[PDB]
PDB file of N, CA and C in Angstrom:
ATOM      1  N   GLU A 177     -13.097  12.247  18.581  1.00  0.00           N
ATOM      2  CA  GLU A 177     -13.045  10.856  19.030  1.00  0.00           C
ATOM      3  C   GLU A 177     -13.548   9.899  17.952  1.00  0.00           C
ATOM      4  N   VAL A 178     -14.778  10.125  17.488  1.00  0.00           N
ATOM      5  CA  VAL A 178     -15.362   9.271  16.456  1.00  0.00           C
ATOM      6  C   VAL A 178     -14.470   9.244  15.220  1.00  0.00           C
ATOM      7  N   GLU A 179     -14.051  10.422  14.756  1.00  0.00           N
ATOM      8  CA  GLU A 179     -13.214  10.508  13.564  1.00  0.00           C
ATOM      9  C   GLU A 179     -11.909   9.736  13.733  1.00  0.00           C
ATOM     10  N   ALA A 180     -11.248   9.883  14.879  1.00  0.00           N
ATOM     11  CA  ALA A 180     -10.021   9.122  15.083  1.00  0.00           C
ATOM     12  C   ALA A 180     -10.315   7.630  15.209  1.00  0.00           C
ATOM     13  N   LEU A 181     -11.485   7.273  15.732  1.00  0.00           N
ATOM     14  CA  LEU A 181     -11.846   5.864  15.811  1.00  0.00           C
ATOM     15  C   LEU A 181     -12.138   5.293  14.427  1.00  0.00           C
ATOM     16  N   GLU A 182     -12.822   6.056  13.575  1.00  0.00           N
ATOM     17  CA  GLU A 182     -12.983   5.639  12.187  1.00  0.00           C
ATOM     18  C   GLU A 182     -11.626   5.396  11.536  1.00  0.00           C
ATOM     19  N   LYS A 183     -10.668   6.294  11.782  1.00  0.00           N
ATOM     20  CA  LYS A 183      -9.310   6.122  11.275  1.00  0.00           C
ATOM     21  C   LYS A 183      -8.690   4.822  11.775  1.00  0.00           C
ATOM     22  N   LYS A 184      -8.765   4.578  13.083  1.00  0.00           N
ATOM     23  CA  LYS A 184      -8.191   3.357  13.636  1.00  0.00           C
ATOM     24  C   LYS A 184      -8.857   2.125  13.042  1.00  0.00           C
ATOM     25  N   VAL A 185     -10.187   2.136  12.948  1.00  0.00           N
ATOM     26  CA  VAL A 185     -10.906   0.983  12.419  1.00  0.00           C
ATOM     27  C   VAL A 185     -10.517   0.730  10.967  1.00  0.00           C
ATOM     28  N   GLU A 186     -10.310   1.795  10.195  1.00  0.00           N
ATOM     29  CA  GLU A 186      -9.989   1.607   8.785  1.00  0.00           C
ATOM     30  C   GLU A 186      -8.569   1.087   8.595  1.00  0.00           C
ATOM     31  N   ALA A 187      -7.638   1.486   9.459  1.00  0.00           N
ATOM     32  CA  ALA A 187      -6.316   0.878   9.433  1.00  0.00           C
ATOM     33  C   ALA A 187      -6.389  -0.598   9.805  1.00  0.00           C
ATOM     34  N   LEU A 188      -7.239  -0.940  10.780  1.00  0.00           N
ATOM     35  CA  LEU A 188      -7.386  -2.329  11.210  1.00  0.00           C
ATOM     36  C   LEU A 188      -8.003  -3.187  10.120  1.00  0.00           C
ATOM     37  N   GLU A 189      -8.977  -2.653   9.397  1.00  0.00           N
ATOM     38  CA  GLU A 189      -9.577  -3.418   8.323  1.00  0.00           C
ATOM     39  C   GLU A 189      -8.534  -3.762   7.256  1.00  0.00           C
ATOM     40  N   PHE A 190      -7.623  -2.837   6.964  1.00  0.00           N
ATOM     41  CA  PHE A 190      -6.558  -3.106   6.010  1.00  0.00           C
ATOM     42  C   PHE A 190      -5.658  -4.172   6.599  1.00  0.00           C
ATOM     43  N   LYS A 191      -5.155  -3.964   7.810  1.00  0.00           N
ATOM     44  CA  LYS A 191      -4.259  -4.945   8.406  1.00  0.00           C
ATOM     45  C   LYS A 191      -4.876  -6.332   8.400  1.00  0.00           C
ATOM     46  N   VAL A 192      -6.141  -6.422   8.807  1.00  0.00           N
ATOM     47  CA  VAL A 192      -6.799  -7.724   8.866  1.00  0.00           C
ATOM     48  C   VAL A 192      -6.913  -8.328   7.465  1.00  0.00           C
ATOM     49  N   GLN A 193      -7.227  -7.508   6.460  1.00  0.00           N
ATOM     50  CA  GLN A 193      -7.288  -8.025   5.089  1.00  0.00           C
ATOM     51  C   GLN A 193      -5.938  -8.580   4.640  1.00  0.00           C
ATOM     52  N   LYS A 194      -4.851  -7.857   4.923  1.00  0.00           N
ATOM     53  CA  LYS A 194      -3.524  -8.361   4.578  1.00  0.00           C
ATOM     54  C   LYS A 194      -3.212  -9.658   5.318  1.00  0.00           C
ATOM     55  N   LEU A 195      -3.541  -9.721   6.612  1.00  0.00           N
ATOM     56  CA  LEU A 195      -3.381 -10.963   7.367  1.00  0.00           C
ATOM     57  C   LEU A 195      -4.154 -12.112   6.721  1.00  0.00           C
ATOM     58  N   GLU A 196      -5.426 -11.881   6.386  1.00  0.00           N
ATOM     59  CA  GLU A 196      -6.224 -12.934   5.752  1.00  0.00           C
ATOM     60  C   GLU A 196      -5.545 -13.475   4.496  1.00  0.00           C
ATOM     61  N   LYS A 197      -5.063 -12.573   3.637  1.00  0.00           N
ATOM     62  CA  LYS A 197      -4.354 -12.992   2.431  1.00  0.00           C
ATOM     63  C   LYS A 197      -3.118 -13.815   2.766  1.00  0.00           C
ATOM     64  N   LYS A 198      -2.337 -13.382   3.756  1.00  0.00           N
ATOM     65  CA  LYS A 198      -1.117 -14.113   4.069  1.00  0.00           C
ATOM     66  C   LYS A 198      -1.442 -15.459   4.697  1.00  0.00           C
ATOM     67  N   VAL A 199      -2.470 -15.509   5.544  1.00  0.00           N
ATOM     68  CA  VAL A 199      -2.877 -16.777   6.159  1.00  0.00           C
ATOM     69  C   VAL A 199      -3.418 -17.749   5.108  1.00  0.00           C
ATOM     70  N   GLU A 200      -4.214 -17.262   4.147  1.00  0.00           N
ATOM     71  CA  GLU A 200      -4.668 -18.153   3.073  1.00  0.00           C
ATOM     72  C   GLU A 200      -3.489 -18.688   2.269  1.00  0.00           C
ATOM     73  N   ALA A 201      -2.518 -17.827   1.969  1.00  0.00           N
ATOM     74  CA  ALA A 201      -1.327 -18.270   1.251  1.00  0.00           C
ATOM     75  C   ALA A 201      -0.597 -19.363   2.016  1.00  0.00           C
ATOM     76  N   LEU A 202      -0.558 -19.256   3.351  1.00  0.00           N
ATOM     77  CA  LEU A 202       0.107 -20.273   4.167  1.00  0.00           C
ATOM     78  C   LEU A 202      -0.689 -21.571   4.207  1.00  0.00           C
ATOM     79  N   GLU A 203      -2.017 -21.484   4.200  1.00  0.00           N
ATOM     80  CA  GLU A 203      -2.830 -22.693   4.293  1.00  0.00           C
ATOM     81  C   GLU A 203      -2.819 -23.484   2.994  1.00  0.00           C
ATOM     82  N   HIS A 204      -2.795 -22.792   1.863  1.00  0.00           N
ATOM     83  CA  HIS A 204      -2.985 -23.426   0.567  1.00  0.00           C
ATOM     84  C   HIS A 204      -1.677 -23.771  -0.117  1.00  0.00           C
ATOM     85  N   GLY A 205      -0.544 -23.431   0.489  1.00  0.00           N
ATOM     86  CA  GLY A 205       0.724 -23.554  -0.204  1.00  0.00           C
ATOM     87  C   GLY A 205       0.793 -22.719  -1.463  1.00  0.00           C
ATOM     88  N   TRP A 206       0.109 -21.570  -1.480  1.00  0.00           N
ATOM     89  CA  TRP A 206       0.043 -20.739  -2.676  1.00  0.00           C
ATOM     90  C   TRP A 206       1.434 -20.250  -3.045  1.00  0.00           C
ATOM     91  N   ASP A 207       1.870 -20.600  -4.262  1.00  0.00           N
ATOM     92  CA  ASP A 207       3.139 -20.132  -4.819  1.00  0.00           C
ATOM     93  C   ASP A 207       4.324 -20.582  -3.965  1.00  0.00           C
ATOM     94  N   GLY A 208       4.267 -21.819  -3.470  1.00  0.00           N
ATOM     95  CA  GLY A 208       5.315 -22.330  -2.611  1.00  0.00           C
ATOM     96  C   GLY A 208       5.360 -21.731  -1.222  1.00  0.00           C
ATOM     97  N   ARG A 209       4.510 -20.750  -0.921  1.00  0.00           N
ATOM     98  CA  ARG A 209       4.390 -20.241   0.436  1.00  0.00           C
ATOM     99  C   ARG A 209       3.772 -21.319   1.322  1.00  0.00           C
TER     100      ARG A 209
ATOM    101  N   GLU B  89     -20.794   4.517  24.857  1.00  0.00           N
ATOM    102  CA  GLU B  89     -20.625   3.820  23.582  1.00  0.00           C
ATOM    103  C   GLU B  89     -19.231   4.046  23.001  1.00  0.00           C
ATOM    104  N   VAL B  90     -18.866   5.315  22.814  1.00  0.00           N
ATOM    105  CA  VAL B  90     -17.554   5.649  22.263  1.00  0.00           C
ATOM    106  C   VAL B  90     -16.447   5.038  23.115  1.00  0.00           C
ATOM    107  N   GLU B  91     -16.530   5.228  24.432  1.00  0.00           N
ATOM    108  CA  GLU B  91     -15.508   4.707  25.334  1.00  0.00           C
ATOM    109  C   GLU B  91     -15.380   3.190  25.225  1.00  0.00           C
ATOM    110  N   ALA B  92     -16.502   2.474  25.196  1.00  0.00           N
ATOM    111  CA  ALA B  92     -16.408   1.028  25.048  1.00  0.00           C
ATOM    112  C   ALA B  92     -15.891   0.650  23.664  1.00  0.00           C
ATOM    113  N   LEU B  93     -16.182   1.464  22.652  1.00  0.00           N
ATOM    114  CA  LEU B  93     -15.656   1.189  21.322  1.00  0.00           C
ATOM    115  C   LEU B  93     -14.151   1.435  21.264  1.00  0.00           C
ATOM    116  N   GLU B  94     -13.675   2.502  21.905  1.00  0.00           N
ATOM    117  CA  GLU B  94     -12.235   2.696  22.032  1.00  0.00           C
ATOM    118  C   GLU B  94     -11.584   1.485  22.690  1.00  0.00           C
ATOM    119  N   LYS B  95     -12.210   0.961  23.748  1.00  0.00           N
ATOM    120  CA  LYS B  95     -11.719  -0.244  24.408  1.00  0.00           C
ATOM    121  C   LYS B  95     -11.650  -1.420  23.440  1.00  0.00           C
ATOM    122  N   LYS B  96     -12.735  -1.665  22.706  1.00  0.00           N
ATOM    123  CA  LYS B  96     -12.746  -2.776  21.761  1.00  0.00           C
ATOM    124  C   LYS B  96     -11.673  -2.596  20.698  1.00  0.00           C
ATOM    125  N   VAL B  97     -11.551  -1.386  20.151  1.00  0.00           N
ATOM    126  CA  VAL B  97     -10.568  -1.137  19.103  1.00  0.00           C
ATOM    127  C   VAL B  97      -9.155  -1.357  19.632  1.00  0.00           C
ATOM    128  N   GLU B  98      -8.905  -0.975  20.883  1.00  0.00           N
ATOM    129  CA  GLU B  98      -7.555  -1.114  21.417  1.00  0.00           C
ATOM    130  C   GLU B  98      -7.208  -2.570  21.702  1.00  0.00           C
ATOM    131  N   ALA B  99      -8.188  -3.377  22.105  1.00  0.00           N
ATOM    132  CA  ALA B  99      -7.951  -4.809  22.213  1.00  0.00           C
ATOM    133  C   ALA B  99      -7.672  -5.417  20.843  1.00  0.00           C
ATOM    134  N   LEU B 100      -8.389  -4.956  19.813  1.00  0.00           N
ATOM    135  CA  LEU B 100      -8.196  -5.471  18.459  1.00  0.00           C
ATOM    136  C   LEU B 100      -6.830  -5.100  17.911  1.00  0.00           C
ATOM    137  N   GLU B 101      -6.366  -3.890  18.188  1.00  0.00           N
ATOM    138  CA  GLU B 101      -5.053  -3.498  17.717  1.00  0.00           C
ATOM    139  C   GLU B 101      -3.972  -4.403  18.315  1.00  0.00           C
ATOM    140  N   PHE B 102      -4.120  -4.786  19.580  1.00  0.00           N
ATOM    141  CA  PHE B 102      -3.173  -5.698  20.205  1.00  0.00           C
ATOM    142  C   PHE B 102      -3.292  -7.043  19.516  1.00  0.00           C
ATOM    143  N   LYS B 103      -4.494  -7.601  19.441  1.00  0.00           N
ATOM    144  CA  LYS B 103      -4.653  -8.906  18.817  1.00  0.00           C
ATOM    145  C   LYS B 103      -4.051  -8.930  17.424  1.00  0.00           C
ATOM    146  N   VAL B 104      -4.345  -7.901  16.631  1.00  0.00           N
ATOM    147  CA  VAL B 104      -3.836  -7.863  15.264  1.00  0.00           C
ATOM    148  C   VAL B 104      -2.309  -7.787  15.264  1.00  0.00           C
ATOM    149  N   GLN B 105      -1.727  -7.003  16.175  1.00  0.00           N
ATOM    150  CA  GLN B 105      -0.264  -6.943  16.259  1.00  0.00           C
ATOM    151  C   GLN B 105       0.333  -8.310  16.584  1.00  0.00           C
ATOM    152  N   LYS B 106      -0.258  -9.028  17.544  1.00  0.00           N
ATOM    153  CA  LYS B 106       0.225 -10.369  17.859  1.00  0.00           C
ATOM    154  C   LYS B 106       0.084 -11.307  16.665  1.00  0.00           C
ATOM    155  N   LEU B 107      -1.055 -11.247  15.968  1.00  0.00           N
ATOM    156  CA  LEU B 107      -1.228 -12.029  14.745  1.00  0.00           C
ATOM    157  C   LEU B 107      -0.140 -11.710  13.721  1.00  0.00           C
ATOM    158  N   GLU B 108       0.108 -10.422  13.470  1.00  0.00           N
ATOM    159  CA  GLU B 108       1.146 -10.044  12.508  1.00  0.00           C
ATOM    160  C   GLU B 108       2.493 -10.675  12.858  1.00  0.00           C
ATOM    161  N   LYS B 109       2.883 -10.593  14.133  1.00  0.00           N
ATOM    162  CA  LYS B 109       4.132 -11.207  14.575  1.00  0.00           C
ATOM    163  C   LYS B 109       4.133 -12.710  14.331  1.00  0.00           C
ATOM    164  N   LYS B 110       3.029 -13.388  14.646  1.00  0.00           N
ATOM    165  CA  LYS B 110       3.013 -14.834  14.477  1.00  0.00           C
ATOM    166  C   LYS B 110       3.013 -15.205  13.003  1.00  0.00           C
ATOM    167  N   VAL B 111       2.294 -14.441  12.178  1.00  0.00           N
ATOM    168  CA  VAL B 111       2.277 -14.704  10.735  1.00  0.00           C
ATOM    169  C   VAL B 111       3.653 -14.455  10.113  1.00  0.00           C
ATOM    170  N   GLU B 112       4.348 -13.385  10.524  1.00  0.00           N
ATOM    171  CA  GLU B 112       5.709 -13.176  10.015  1.00  0.00           C
ATOM    172  C   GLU B 112       6.626 -14.325  10.418  1.00  0.00           C
ATOM    173  N   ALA B 113       6.511 -14.787  11.662  1.00  0.00           N
ATOM    174  CA  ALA B 113       7.311 -15.922  12.110  1.00  0.00           C
ATOM    175  C   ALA B 113       7.049 -17.153  11.257  1.00  0.00           C
ATOM    176  N   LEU B 114       5.791 -17.358  10.845  1.00  0.00           N
ATOM    177  CA  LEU B 114       5.453 -18.508  10.006  1.00  0.00           C
ATOM    178  C   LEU B 114       5.982 -18.342   8.587  1.00  0.00           C
ATOM    179  N   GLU B 115       5.992 -17.116   8.069  1.00  0.00           N
ATOM    180  CA  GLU B 115       6.436 -16.906   6.694  1.00  0.00           C
ATOM    181  C   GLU B 115       7.946 -17.036   6.561  1.00  0.00           C
ATOM    182  N   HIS B 116       8.684 -16.587   7.567  1.00  0.00           N
ATOM    183  CA  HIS B 116      10.131 -16.473   7.469  1.00  0.00           C
ATOM    184  C   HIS B 116      10.857 -17.677   8.036  1.00  0.00           C
ATOM    185  N   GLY B 117      10.130 -18.647   8.581  1.00  0.00           N
ATOM    186  CA  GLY B 117      10.773 -19.722   9.313  1.00  0.00           C
ATOM    187  C   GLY B 117      11.567 -19.233  10.504  1.00  0.00           C
ATOM    188  N   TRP B 118      11.124 -18.140  11.136  1.00  0.00           N
ATOM    189  CA  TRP B 118      11.866 -17.544  12.239  1.00  0.00           C
ATOM    190  C   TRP B 118      11.955 -18.525  13.396  1.00  0.00           C
ATOM    191  N   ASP B 119      13.194 -18.866  13.776  1.00  0.00           N
ATOM    192  CA  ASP B 119      13.466 -19.717  14.934  1.00  0.00           C
ATOM    193  C   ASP B 119      12.842 -21.103  14.768  1.00  0.00           C
ATOM    194  N   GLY B 120      12.910 -21.645  13.552  1.00  0.00           N
ATOM    195  CA  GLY B 120      12.310 -22.935  13.274  1.00  0.00           C
ATOM    196  C   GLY B 120      10.797 -22.949  13.243  1.00  0.00           C
ATOM    197  N   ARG B 121      10.141 -21.829  13.541  1.00  0.00           N
ATOM    198  CA  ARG B 121       8.699 -21.728  13.376  1.00  0.00           C
ATOM    199  C   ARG B 121       8.363 -21.766  11.888  1.00  0.00           C
TER     200      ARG B 121
ATOM    201  N   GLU C 213     -23.041   7.181  12.765  1.00  0.00           N
ATOM    202  CA  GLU C 213     -21.598   6.945  12.768  1.00  0.00           C
ATOM    203  C   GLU C 213     -21.206   5.885  13.795  1.00  0.00           C
ATOM    204  N   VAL C 214     -21.577   6.116  15.055  1.00  0.00           N
ATOM    205  CA  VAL C 214     -21.255   5.170  16.121  1.00  0.00           C
ATOM    206  C   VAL C 214     -21.808   3.788  15.791  1.00  0.00           C
ATOM    207  N   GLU C 215     -23.080   3.729  15.400  1.00  0.00           N
ATOM    208  CA  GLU C 215     -23.714   2.452  15.086  1.00  0.00           C
ATOM    209  C   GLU C 215     -22.987   1.724  13.959  1.00  0.00           C
ATOM    210  N   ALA C 216     -22.628   2.435  12.892  1.00  0.00           N
ATOM    211  CA  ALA C 216     -21.894   1.773  11.822  1.00  0.00           C
ATOM    212  C   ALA C 216     -20.494   1.376  12.280  1.00  0.00           C
ATOM    213  N   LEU C 217     -19.906   2.138  13.199  1.00  0.00           N
ATOM    214  CA  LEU C 217     -18.598   1.767  13.724  1.00  0.00           C
ATOM    215  C   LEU C 217     -18.695   0.532  14.615  1.00  0.00           C
ATOM    216  N   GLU C 218     -19.736   0.446  15.442  1.00  0.00           N
ATOM    217  CA  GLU C 218     -19.976  -0.782  16.190  1.00  0.00           C
ATOM    218  C   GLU C 218     -20.089  -1.975  15.248  1.00  0.00           C
ATOM    219  N   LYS C 219     -20.812  -1.802  14.138  1.00  0.00           N
ATOM    220  CA  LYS C 219     -20.925  -2.849  13.127  1.00  0.00           C
ATOM    221  C   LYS C 219     -19.557  -3.245  12.581  1.00  0.00           C
ATOM    222  N   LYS C 220     -18.755  -2.257  12.183  1.00  0.00           N
ATOM    223  CA  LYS C 220     -17.434  -2.558  11.645  1.00  0.00           C
ATOM    224  C   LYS C 220     -16.575  -3.272  12.677  1.00  0.00           C
ATOM    225  N   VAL C 221     -16.586  -2.790  13.920  1.00  0.00           N
ATOM    226  CA  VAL C 221     -15.767  -3.397  14.963  1.00  0.00           C
ATOM    227  C   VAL C 221     -16.200  -4.838  15.210  1.00  0.00           C
ATOM    228  N   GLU C 222     -17.502  -5.105  15.148  1.00  0.00           N
ATOM    229  CA  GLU C 222     -17.971  -6.457  15.430  1.00  0.00           C
ATOM    230  C   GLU C 222     -17.634  -7.419  14.298  1.00  0.00           C
ATOM    231  N   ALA C 223     -17.634  -6.942  13.054  1.00  0.00           N
ATOM    232  CA  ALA C 223     -17.142  -7.767  11.961  1.00  0.00           C
ATOM    233  C   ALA C 223     -15.653  -8.050  12.121  1.00  0.00           C
ATOM    234  N   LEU C 224     -14.887  -7.050  12.573  1.00  0.00           N
ATOM    235  CA  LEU C 224     -13.448  -7.220  12.764  1.00  0.00           C
ATOM    236  C   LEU C 224     -13.147  -8.200  13.883  1.00  0.00           C
ATOM    237  N   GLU C 225     -13.917  -8.156  14.961  1.00  0.00           N
ATOM    238  CA  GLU C 225     -13.691  -9.093  16.043  1.00  0.00           C
ATOM    239  C   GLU C 225     -13.891 -10.533  15.562  1.00  0.00           C
ATOM    240  N   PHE C 226     -14.876 -10.763  14.699  1.00  0.00           N
ATOM    241  CA  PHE C 226     -15.092 -12.091  14.142  1.00  0.00           C
ATOM    242  C   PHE C 226     -13.903 -12.433  13.268  1.00  0.00           C
ATOM    243  N   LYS C 227     -13.565 -11.577  12.311  1.00  0.00           N
ATOM    244  CA  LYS C 227     -12.449 -11.877  11.426  1.00  0.00           C
ATOM    245  C   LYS C 227     -11.192 -12.202  12.211  1.00  0.00           C
ATOM    246  N   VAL C 228     -10.892 -11.383  13.218  1.00  0.00           N
ATOM    247  CA  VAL C 228      -9.681 -11.603  14.003  1.00  0.00           C
ATOM    248  C   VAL C 228      -9.760 -12.938  14.744  1.00  0.00           C
ATOM    249  N   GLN C 229     -10.932 -13.279  15.285  1.00  0.00           N
ATOM    250  CA  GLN C 229     -11.077 -14.577  15.952  1.00  0.00           C
ATOM    251  C   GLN C 229     -10.821 -15.733  14.988  1.00  0.00           C
ATOM    252  N   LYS C 230     -11.375 -15.657  13.774  1.00  0.00           N
ATOM    253  CA  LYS C 230     -11.118 -16.698  12.784  1.00  0.00           C
ATOM    254  C   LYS C 230      -9.637 -16.769  12.423  1.00  0.00           C
ATOM    255  N   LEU C 231      -8.995 -15.613  12.233  1.00  0.00           N
ATOM    256  CA  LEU C 231      -7.552 -15.586  11.996  1.00  0.00           C
ATOM    257  C   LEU C 231      -6.788 -16.263  13.133  1.00  0.00           C
ATOM    258  N   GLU C 232      -7.105 -15.909  14.380  1.00  0.00           N
ATOM    259  CA  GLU C 232      -6.420 -16.526  15.520  1.00  0.00           C
ATOM    260  C   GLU C 232      -6.515 -18.050  15.474  1.00  0.00           C
ATOM    261  N   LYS C 233      -7.720 -18.570  15.222  1.00  0.00           N
ATOM    262  CA  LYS C 233      -7.903 -20.014  15.111  1.00  0.00           C
ATOM    263  C   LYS C 233      -7.055 -20.601  13.991  1.00  0.00           C
ATOM    264  N   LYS C 234      -7.026 -19.946  12.830  1.00  0.00           N
ATOM    265  CA  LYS C 234      -6.269 -20.506  11.719  1.00  0.00           C
ATOM    266  C   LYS C 234      -4.775 -20.423  11.988  1.00  0.00           C
ATOM    267  N   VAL C 235      -4.322 -19.329  12.604  1.00  0.00           N
ATOM    268  CA  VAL C 235      -2.901 -19.191  12.940  1.00  0.00           C
ATOM    269  C   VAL C 235      -2.482 -20.219  13.993  1.00  0.00           C
ATOM    270  N   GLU C 236      -3.322 -20.461  15.009  1.00  0.00           N
ATOM    271  CA  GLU C 236      -2.988 -21.511  15.979  1.00  0.00           C
ATOM    272  C   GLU C 236      -2.903 -22.875  15.304  1.00  0.00           C
ATOM    273  N   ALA C 237      -3.837 -23.164  14.399  1.00  0.00           N
ATOM    274  CA  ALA C 237      -3.796 -24.425  13.665  1.00  0.00           C
ATOM    275  C   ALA C 237      -2.499 -24.565  12.883  1.00  0.00           C
ATOM    276  N   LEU C 238      -2.002 -23.458  12.315  1.00  0.00           N
ATOM    277  CA  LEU C 238      -0.750 -23.499  11.560  1.00  0.00           C
ATOM    278  C   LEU C 238       0.454 -23.675  12.477  1.00  0.00           C
ATOM    279  N   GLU C 239       0.413 -23.091  13.671  1.00  0.00           N
ATOM    280  CA  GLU C 239       1.562 -23.179  14.569  1.00  0.00           C
ATOM    281  C   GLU C 239       1.691 -24.563  15.187  1.00  0.00           C
ATOM    282  N   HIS C 240       0.568 -25.199  15.491  1.00  0.00           N
ATOM    283  CA  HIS C 240       0.565 -26.431  16.265  1.00  0.00           C
ATOM    284  C   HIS C 240       0.529 -27.673  15.396  1.00  0.00           C
ATOM    285  N   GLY C 241       0.460 -27.513  14.078  1.00  0.00           N
ATOM    286  CA  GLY C 241       0.224 -28.654  13.213  1.00  0.00           C
ATOM    287  C   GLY C 241      -1.086 -29.352  13.502  1.00  0.00           C
ATOM    288  N   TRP C 242      -2.102 -28.603  13.945  1.00  0.00           N
ATOM    289  CA  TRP C 242      -3.375 -29.196  14.331  1.00  0.00           C
ATOM    290  C   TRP C 242      -4.020 -29.871  13.132  1.00  0.00           C
ATOM    291  N   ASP C 243      -4.261 -31.183  13.261  1.00  0.00           N
ATOM    292  CA  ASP C 243      -4.966 -31.967  12.248  1.00  0.00           C
ATOM    293  C   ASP C 243      -4.219 -31.957  10.914  1.00  0.00           C
ATOM    294  N   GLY C 244      -2.890 -32.048  10.974  1.00  0.00           N
ATOM    295  CA  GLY C 244      -2.082 -32.003   9.773  1.00  0.00           C
ATOM    296  C   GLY C 244      -2.002 -30.650   9.100  1.00  0.00           C
ATOM    297  N   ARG C 245      -2.720 -29.645   9.598  1.00  0.00           N
ATOM    298  CA  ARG C 245      -2.568 -28.286   9.102  1.00  0.00           C
ATOM    299  C   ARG C 245      -1.191 -27.761   9.495  1.00  0.00           C
TER     300      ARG C 245
END
């Protein structure tokens, strides 16, 4: 259980990091985005 | 503890999925979004 | 393990909440955003 939860949390941390990058790009008009 | 953490993680996976969909809609101009 | 996972999940819940707010601001044109 714990091990699979660590796995899920680590996938979520990646997803959230990618979201943060894309949201910042949208807010700042980065590179015409 | 584990059970409530599984609950929290599963709510987060949904939230993150909805965010991903909304962010893609914003990036692609999907449906005038 | 559990304690550090609770920590990670709680940081993620904050990050996701901030993302949700920023994504809503982008969708609604809130305050010229």
